[PDB]
Ligand binder design. Sequence first.
Ligand SMILES: [Cl-]
Ligand SMILES: [Cl-]
Length: 162
Amino acid sequence: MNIFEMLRIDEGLRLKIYKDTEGYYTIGIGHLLTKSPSLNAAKSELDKAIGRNTNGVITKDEAEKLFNQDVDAAVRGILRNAKMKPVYDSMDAVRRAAMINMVFQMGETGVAGFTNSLRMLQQKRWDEAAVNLAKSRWYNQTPNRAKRVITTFRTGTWDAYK
Ligand SMILES: [Cl-]
Ligand SMILES: [Cl-]
């Protein structure tokens, strides 16, 4: 298991524009296109991301390409963040993956606002952090995914994904 497989499990794969859990236009492996209610706006953002007139449909290879870029970008956002970097650096590889998953899903900003959970994770207080993480809109809205991520931080293994 690795970050890519983990996220491919949490996000799925769709080759046509779809709306995500929040109702936003997405495509591929959880690649958010736009928060705008306009499909055309979405189709526009898509062509620009792909570099061609897609008409709303993409290939498997294009999905994977976006996916790679997105994963890379999530890592970089972490490393570039003064609140997050230290937390991420303090953790083992499995737990790092859990953190990348969250940033991928909620963005850097979203994640940097889990201050208290971040402190606990840095302190290696696993059970506490797990409880704190669950007191969130995130957990209430996508509980099944949230539980997988939380178990991951709690145990340091990939068992939630086996
Ligand atoms: Cl892009
Ligand atoms: Cl879920």
